[PDB]
Amino acid sequence: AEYQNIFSQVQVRGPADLGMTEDVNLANRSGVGPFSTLLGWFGNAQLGPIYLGSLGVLSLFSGLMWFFTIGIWFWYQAGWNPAVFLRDLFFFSLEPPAPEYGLSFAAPLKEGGLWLIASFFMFVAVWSWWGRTYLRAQALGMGKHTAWAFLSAIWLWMVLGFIRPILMGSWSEAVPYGIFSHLDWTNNFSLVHGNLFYNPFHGLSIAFLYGSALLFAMHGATILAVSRFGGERELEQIADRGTAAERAALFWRWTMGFNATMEGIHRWAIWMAVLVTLTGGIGILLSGTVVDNWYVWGQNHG
Amino acid sequence: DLASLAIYSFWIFLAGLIYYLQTENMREGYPLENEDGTPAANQGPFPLPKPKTFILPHGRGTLTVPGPESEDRPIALARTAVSEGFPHAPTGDPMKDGVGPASWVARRDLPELDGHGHNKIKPMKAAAGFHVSAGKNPIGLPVRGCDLEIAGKVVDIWVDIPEQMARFLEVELKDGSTRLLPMQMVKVQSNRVHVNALSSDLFAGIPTIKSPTEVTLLEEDKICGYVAGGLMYAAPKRKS
Amino acid sequence: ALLSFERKYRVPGGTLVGGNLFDFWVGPFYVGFFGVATFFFAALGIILIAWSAVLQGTWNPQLISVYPPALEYGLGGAPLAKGGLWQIITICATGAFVSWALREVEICRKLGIGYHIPFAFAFAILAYLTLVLFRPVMMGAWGYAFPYGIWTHLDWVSNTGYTYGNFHYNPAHMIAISFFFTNALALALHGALVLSAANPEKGKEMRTYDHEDTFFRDLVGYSIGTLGIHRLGLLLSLSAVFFSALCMIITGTIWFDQWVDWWQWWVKLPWWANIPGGING
Ligand code: BCL
Ligand code: BCL
Ligand code: BCL
Ligand code: BCL
Ligand SMILES: CC[C@H]1c2cc3[nH]c4c(c3C)C(=O)[C@H](C(=O)OC)c4c3nc(cc4[nH]c(cc(n2)[C@@H]1C)c(C(C)=O)c4C)[C@@H](C)[C@@H]3CCC(=O)OC/C=C(\C)CCC[C@H](C)CCC[C@H](C)CCCC(C)C
Ligand SMILES: CC[C@H]1c2cc3[nH]c4c(c3C)C(=O)[C@H](C(=O)OC)c4c3nc(cc4[nH]c(cc(n2)[C@@H]1C)c(C(C)=O)c4C)[C@@H](C)[C@@H]3CCC(=O)OC/C=C(\C)CCC[C@H](C)CCC[C@H](C)CCCC(C)C
Ligand SMILES: COC(C)(C)C/C=C/C(C)=C/C=C/C(C)=C/C=C/C(C)=C\C=C\C=C(C)\C=C\C=C(/C)CC/C=C(\C)CCC=C(C)C
Ligand SMILES: CCCCCCCCCCCC[N+](C)(C)[O-]
Ligand SMILES: CCCCCCCCCCCC[N+](C)(C)[O-]
Ligand SMILES: CCCCCCCCCCCC[N+](C)(C)[O-]
Ligand SMILES: CCCCCCCCCCCC[N+](C)(C)[O-]
Ligand SMILES: [Fe+3]
């Protein structure tokens, strides 16, 4: 009975891979870390070298600064007691400023403020990391696909906490920092806009999210099925089509009547997924700014 | 209103995207043909895309797709019916001829090279630094077929250097000649390596490489093709 | 009717049932026995759904809706116009899905590839069967199943959800969402990577697997590899749907109260159940 190829039967190690040079400044790349044997049954074993220039350091500082700003506040709520802090961890919440202050930075710390501080720290963390996603690609002379796809995730986020809070004239429309609290905000949002199941963008967003799981289930299983012909070597299979690429295309033509190429399936993949947060971000942006109730809008489309 | 224009605009965008996406996935395989290789009458609603050219990495040249489609090999098959849509039988030995599950494509007869220009796939002996790290080391284990006979023994592991990954087992037959078996088609047991796809007597027939240090893309395809095709054609000798 | 490389693959054999009987194509589509099975079950179910439309008096797909029997019939049969048409279509749908999976297996064997795609699809078949079949039979009526309509099935979601409070708090549901959000992160990245390598700047040469491998180490300090990311995707995906079926099999059966209140096992732990301060004290 055949091997399925989810975990390797035999690992193999050699000299730590320091990567391609191209145009990267090697003055920043770290030393190769250890080799996780656990990791190596599934993917690569090498916890090898992370590049870390100036934009990377900016991110990590402010990312931790945001992470700490929220956390020290959770203690202020927990009475500085570790026992409570651990009991009520999901319940704590750093909530936005009250609607009184509108779109100003004049709020007290115990009434907002601390929330703005954290958000600034998060804002700068994400954008610098994005630029880092672009730059890492240019140094290697690769296309900017990863930076475009990341932009679409930024879109949804950028709408939820910035673009849409601005258009309502209030920071209260923003998401609080909390495990159970940000959940409540979400369920709350649907209710106040007359059920988001009626937002035609919401339900398109769902189609793409469902489709992302369906596609990657499809693709992943297909590459595993034709790995016996070295299907995973997708880049070379693009420049020189092997039988792996052929019986992969042919499985699907024979099943559902049409098919992809080895390159084309990845265009399907990046789009299917990228449209989850694109559609979804438009659906939120319209909620409360142009449409007050998605039930009402739905009745008389307009 | 604003929302109605947004959603209507979206559906038109989506239709352009589906279109573009489908024409992108037509740079191989097309145009469609009849079972005799002549161009089919109906090609469907979508046009062929304007060709694109890949500049390949190590002076290995250029690829333009879509471009002239041909099997640069003969197909040993015959029609079983007077009309479209039926099986085409092997006219010889499907294993030897390379048809059906045993198919290969005529890829380039060079090996794949890594980023720096070196052969991606070495035997481990010629690969410095590389050792079995975890799991049972297969080197030395005898190799068994789907008929419960011994066919050979493992004498090396061919590894992907940049993936750091075992891609083949080099196997010595009673000839004293070796073969490559793909990792993805063998069970490394404790006391042996087992091979379901092939019975012992079919091991000799595995396509051989023309340079004992390296494999070419043409050769991996003939080898992986051969042994995968055995799942169908060696099944009168498969036992359980 | 054939891709330029197709003929060499269109050999006889590979069929589970019926030998060379249903061993042919119609255009691109492979038939097989289960190709015939899937048409039978599909036509029947489609015809019952048309006949269920005349009992309701609509030929509008945003209105058509085929409801289960009411709780009164329990796990027994029902009259066509009041739940029996649903009960039969559900048999016809399950018939189409299992048949389709098995047709994929036959296609697998003829192509000499592995069985991973059928195997993956079976999880989707399983999520469905949890909703229309497993949760019903455990609860005590087909009525707890969801209706077959485009918006009416959405209303079933919202109401089944809100029966238990804010459904966010189903802990298995929390997990399943993570796998969904993650699988979409992964599919974004994987697609972006391969494409940035195959499609570099201007007149640069096509990048190599090593550039993909480098790019990620540069960024996140790790890289999982070609075999790795395709195992990750199949796994996040399949895992998301596993936790979906799970979060639903437990709701209504071993837990039927409000999902928010379940989290009191944590907060009422005796070591901290009484300490002053916090949110819950
Ligand atoms: C629909 C969009 C709604 C919303 C609805 C929901 C729903 C519904 C659920 C979550 C869930 C989650 N949400 Mg949310 N959430 C939104 C926006 C966000 C944003 C944001 C835009 O910045 C963040 C950072 C989160 C973060 C989180 C996680 C706590 C959790 C799993 C995330 C995940 O799987 O990522 C993908 C996976 C990754 C590995 C990415 C890497 C990030 C990882 C490491 C998580 C970091 C968590 C955080 C920063 C710190 C937690 C500290 C605690 C001590 C644990 N949400 C908006 C408001 N969210 C699920 C949950 O279980 O919450 C309890 C859940 O059920
Ligand atoms: C999965 C968990 C919940 C659920 C929750 C939701 C929510 C929440 C939403 C949907 C949405 C959709 N629902 Mg549902 N839905 C359930 C079970 C099902 C089943 C079933 C098990 O058989 C079906 C057929 C569908 C569902 C459908 C689609 C019509 C639609 C978008 C799916 C998609 O784009 O991605 C999946 C697949 C692909 C991208 C590729 C295939 C897509 C095609 C279009 C399938 C649609 C066929 C449909 C019209 C029925 C035809 C039947 C006969 C052939 C005539 N759901 C259960 C009850 N469903 C979204 C919506 O669009 O609202 C109406 C939405 O917001
Ligand atoms: C009761 C709840 C309401 C409802 C209210 C909402 C609200 C509110 C929203 C959604 C949104 C979404 N909902 Mg809904 N939703 C309901 C029921 C459903 C159901 C269902 C019942 O079956 C489904 C399938 C969905 C599905 C979905 C998603 C398609 C969509 C979010 C996409 C996403 O991936 O965000 C995940 C991704 C992000 C939030 C962006 C993350 C990117 C950032 C930059 C990452 C930051 C990382 C940070 C800096 C560091 C992390 C720490 C690490 C360790 C480094 N909803 C009901 C009707 N839903 C969203 C939407 O798209 O609206 C249309 C939205 O805002
Ligand atoms: C107001 C609504 C409630 C709520 C109530 C529920 C309930 C109740 C359910 C979920 C379920 C789900 N919820 Mg919820 N949920 C809410 C808010 C959310 C949010 C959010 C707030 O952001 C998110 C992201 C989610 C996310 C999710 C998923 C984990 C899950 C749906 C995926 C699934 O099961 O696929 C599974 C996929 C399938 C069943 C499809 C199988 C397809 C079959 C096999 C074949 C179809 C063939 C087709 C007909 C052919 C087409 C014809 C042509 C050929 C095209 N929920 C709120 C709190 N949630 C559902 C679930 O967990 O299901 C078990 C569910 O029932
Ligand atoms: C189309 C949208 C989909 C998607 C795509 C997507 N996301 C992306 C990308 C793409 C294409 C990127 O390229 C980018 C990425 O970096 O990939 C790994 C990213 C990214 N998506 C992320 C998260 C994320 N994406 C999400 C969703 C989605 N992303 C969708 C599925 C979500 C959801 C579901 O809510 C999350 C949680 C990040 C992993 C990453 C961007 C990270 C970032 O910008 O933050 C900067 C860094 C910090 C804030 C770190 C500090 C905070 C930490 C909690 C502390 C621990 C860090 C560290 C270990 C400390 C070490 C300190 C020292 C001792 C060394
Ligand atoms: C692990 C689960 C994930 C996944 C994977 C997955 N799905 C798959 C596969 C895989 C691996 C395939 O091989 C197979 C495929 O062929 O893809 C193109 C498939 C497939 N997944 C599909 C849909 C689908 N998958 C879904 C989800 C998921 N699939 C997950 C993301 C959903 C969701 C999210 O809702 C949908 C809608 C199909 C495109 C396809 C299976 C097609 C098929 O089974 O053909 C036979 C059946 C018919 C032609 C239909 C006959 C009609 C019925 C008899 C009556 C209709 C009754 C029905 C209940 C109506 C309900 C409508 C309302 C609820 C709106
Ligand atoms: C162990 O103890 C220590 C000290 C280590 C601390 C522990 C840390 C803890 C417990 C951290 C907990 C943090 C949590 C759980 C955060 C959760 C966030 C969640 C669940 C969701 C996040 C959603 C937030 C979003 C969508 C925010 C979007 C923000 C933006 C779009 C930017 C907004 C920017 C603003 C308002 C400022 C504008 C300013 C300028 C000038 C640009
Ligand atoms: C990558 C392209 C995939 C296309 C997926 C198409 C799904 C259509 C879903 C229609 C449901 C939409 N709604 C709610 C807005 O009417
Ligand atoms: C016929 C109307 C056209 C409306 C716009 C459609 C947009 C097409 C989407 C694909 C664009 C692709 N891209 C960016 C690679 O060029
Ligand atoms: C979300 C599903 C999108 C379907 C897009 C259209 C697919 C059918 C077109 C393929 C035409 C193929 N063929 C056989 C002529 O080569
Ligand atoms: C919901 C979308 C369904 C898409 C189905 C696509 C089937 C395409 C069939 C093309 C038939 C072509 N032929 C004969 C040239 O092979
Ligand atoms: Fe891939």
mmCIF file of N, CA, C and O in Angstrom, chain C residues 171-202:
data_model
loop_
_atom_site.group_PDB
_atom_site.id
_atom_site.type_symbol
_atom_site.label_atom_id
_atom_site.label_comp_id
_atom_site.label_asym_id
_atom_site.label_seq_id
_atom_site.Cartn_x
_atom_site.Cartn_y
_atom_site.Cartn_z
ATOM 1 N N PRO C 171 -16.595 27.252 21.086
ATOM 2 C CA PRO C 171 -15.124 27.244 21.053
ATOM 3 C C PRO C 171 -14.543 26.497 19.837
ATOM 4 O O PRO C 171 -13.518 26.896 19.288
ATOM 5 N N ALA C 172 -15.244 25.462 19.381
ATOM 6 C CA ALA C 172 -14.836 24.728 18.185
ATOM 7 C C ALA C 172 -15.045 25.590 16.943
ATOM 8 O O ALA C 172 -14.350 25.426 15.937
ATOM 9 N N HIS C 173 -16.023 26.487 17.020
ATOM 10 C CA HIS C 173 -16.328 27.419 15.945
ATOM 11 C C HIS C 173 -15.198 28.431 15.864
ATOM 12 O O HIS C 173 -14.732 28.734 14.775
ATOM 13 N N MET C 174 -14.665 28.832 17.018
ATOM 14 C CA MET C 174 -13.548 29.785 17.081
ATOM 15 C C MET C 174 -12.370 29.210 16.318
ATOM 16 O O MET C 174 -11.688 29.922 15.574
ATOM 17 N N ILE C 175 -12.115 27.923 16.552
ATOM 18 C CA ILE C 175 -10.949 27.255 16.001
ATOM 19 C C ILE C 175 -11.088 27.189 14.496
ATOM 20 O O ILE C 175 -10.244 27.728 13.775
ATOM 21 N N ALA C 176 -12.242 26.701 14.047
ATOM 22 C CA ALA C 176 -12.549 26.571 12.627
ATOM 23 C C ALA C 176 -12.379 27.878 11.849
ATOM 24 O O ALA C 176 -12.014 27.857 10.684
ATOM 25 N N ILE C 177 -12.654 29.011 12.484
ATOM 26 C CA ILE C 177 -12.536 30.297 11.806
ATOM 27 C C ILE C 177 -11.072 30.617 11.575
ATOM 28 O O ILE C 177 -10.709 31.239 10.578
ATOM 29 N N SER C 178 -10.239 30.206 12.524
ATOM 30 C CA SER C 178 -8.807 30.433 12.443
ATOM 31 C C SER C 178 -8.217 29.710 11.240
ATOM 32 O O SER C 178 -7.513 30.310 10.420
ATOM 33 N N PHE C 179 -8.587 28.445 11.093
ATOM 34 C CA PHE C 179 -8.175 27.683 9.941
ATOM 35 C C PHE C 179 -8.666 28.275 8.620
ATOM 36 O O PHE C 179 -7.892 28.349 7.674
ATOM 37 N N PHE C 180 -9.874 28.840 8.600
ATOM 38 C CA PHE C 180 -10.380 29.538 7.411
ATOM 39 C C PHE C 180 -9.592 30.814 7.089
ATOM 40 O O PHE C 180 -9.179 31.023 5.945
ATOM 41 N N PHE C 181 -9.385 31.664 8.088
ATOM 42 C CA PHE C 181 -8.621 32.882 7.878
ATOM 43 C C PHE C 181 -7.175 32.547 7.496
ATOM 44 O O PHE C 181 -6.532 33.263 6.718
ATOM 45 N N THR C 182 -6.658 31.459 8.057
ATOM 46 C CA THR C 182 -5.265 31.094 7.831
ATOM 47 C C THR C 182 -5.096 30.517 6.430
ATOM 48 O O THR C 182 -4.184 30.903 5.691
ATOM 49 N N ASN C 183 -6.005 29.620 6.060
ATOM 50 C CA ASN C 183 -5.934 28.964 4.767
ATOM 51 C C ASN C 183 -5.986 29.989 3.657
ATOM 52 O O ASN C 183 -5.365 29.810 2.620
ATOM 53 N N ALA C 184 -6.626 31.117 3.923
ATOM 54 C CA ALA C 184 -6.731 32.157 2.922
ATOM 55 C C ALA C 184 -5.490 33.022 2.904
ATOM 56 O O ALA C 184 -5.124 33.531 1.856
ATOM 57 N N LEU C 185 -4.843 33.186 4.058
ATOM 58 C CA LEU C 185 -3.524 33.840 4.122
ATOM 59 C C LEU C 185 -2.508 33.041 3.295
ATOM 60 O O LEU C 185 -1.873 33.578 2.373
ATOM 61 N N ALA C 186 -2.475 31.736 3.555
ATOM 62 C CA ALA C 186 -1.575 30.810 2.880
ATOM 63 C C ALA C 186 -1.787 30.748 1.369
ATOM 64 O O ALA C 186 -0.821 30.770 0.599
ATOM 65 N N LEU C 187 -3.045 30.673 0.941
ATOM 66 C CA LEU C 187 -3.346 30.642 -0.483
ATOM 67 C C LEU C 187 -2.998 31.956 -1.171
ATOM 68 O O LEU C 187 -2.549 31.936 -2.312
ATOM 69 N N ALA C 188 -3.113 33.077 -0.455
ATOM 70 C CA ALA C 188 -2.669 34.374 -0.982
ATOM 71 C C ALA C 188 -1.170 34.380 -1.225
ATOM 72 O O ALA C 188 -0.706 34.640 -2.340
ATOM 73 N N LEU C 189 -0.427 33.982 -0.190
ATOM 74 C CA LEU C 189 1.031 33.947 -0.237
ATOM 75 C C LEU C 189 1.547 32.983 -1.299
ATOM 76 O O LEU C 189 2.270 33.419 -2.201
ATOM 77 N N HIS C 190 1.076 31.731 -1.281
ATOM 78 C CA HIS C 190 1.561 30.721 -2.227
ATOM 79 C C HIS C 190 1.396 31.155 -3.659
ATOM 80 O O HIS C 190 2.220 30.833 -4.500
ATOM 81 N N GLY C 191 0.245 31.753 -3.953
ATOM 82 C CA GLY C 191 -0.040 32.210 -5.301
ATOM 83 C C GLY C 191 0.815 33.397 -5.682
ATOM 84 O O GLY C 191 1.299 33.482 -6.819
ATOM 85 N N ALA C 192 1.035 34.288 -4.718
ATOM 86 C CA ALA C 192 1.853 35.476 -4.940
ATOM 87 C C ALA C 192 3.314 35.091 -5.203
ATOM 88 O O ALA C 192 3.937 35.603 -6.148
ATOM 89 N N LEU C 193 3.806 34.101 -4.452
ATOM 90 C CA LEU C 193 5.208 33.699 -4.537
ATOM 91 C C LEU C 193 5.560 33.131 -5.908
ATOM 92 O O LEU C 193 6.281 33.765 -6.679
ATOM 93 N N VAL C 194 4.978 31.980 -6.231
ATOM 94 C CA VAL C 194 5.123 31.357 -7.539
ATOM 95 C C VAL C 194 5.014 32.380 -8.681
ATOM 96 O O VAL C 194 5.765 32.322 -9.646
ATOM 97 N N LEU C 195 4.121 33.351 -8.554
ATOM 98 C CA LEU C 195 3.908 34.289 -9.648
ATOM 99 C C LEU C 195 4.991 35.358 -9.707
ATOM 100 O O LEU C 195 5.389 35.761 -10.797
ATOM 101 N N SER C 196 5.498 35.775 -8.544
ATOM 102 C CA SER C 196 6.585 36.751 -8.476
ATOM 103 C C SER C 196 7.907 36.155 -8.980
ATOM 104 O O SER C 196 8.772 36.868 -9.498
ATOM 105 N N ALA C 197 8.040 34.836 -8.855
ATOM 106 C CA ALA C 197 9.194 34.122 -9.384
ATOM 107 C C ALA C 197 9.074 33.927 -10.896
ATOM 108 O O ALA C 197 9.992 34.280 -11.645
ATOM 109 N N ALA C 198 7.908 33.469 -11.349
ATOM 110 C CA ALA C 198 7.685 33.212 -12.771
ATOM 111 C C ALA C 198 7.583 34.502 -13.577
ATOM 112 O O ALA C 198 7.842 34.510 -14.784
ATOM 113 N N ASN C 199 7.236 35.594 -12.898
ATOM 114 C CA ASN C 199 7.031 36.888 -13.547
ATOM 115 C C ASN C 199 7.788 37.985 -12.797
ATOM 116 O O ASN C 199 7.189 38.812 -12.093
ATOM 117 N N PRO C 200 9.105 38.069 -13.031
ATOM 118 C CA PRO C 200 10.011 39.020 -12.377
ATOM 119 C C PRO C 200 9.914 40.424 -12.970
ATOM 120 O O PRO C 200 9.019 40.715 -13.765
ATOM 121 N N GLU C 201 10.902 41.259 -12.673
ATOM 122 C CA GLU C 201 10.946 42.601 -13.249
ATOM 123 C C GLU C 201 11.329 42.562 -14.737
ATOM 124 O O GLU C 201 11.902 41.573 -15.203
ATOM 125 N N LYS C 202 10.850 43.560 -15.488
ATOM 126 C CA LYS C 202 11.286 43.877 -16.865
ATOM 127 C C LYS C 202 11.851 42.752 -17.766
ATOM 128 O O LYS C 202 11.095 42.033 -18.433
#
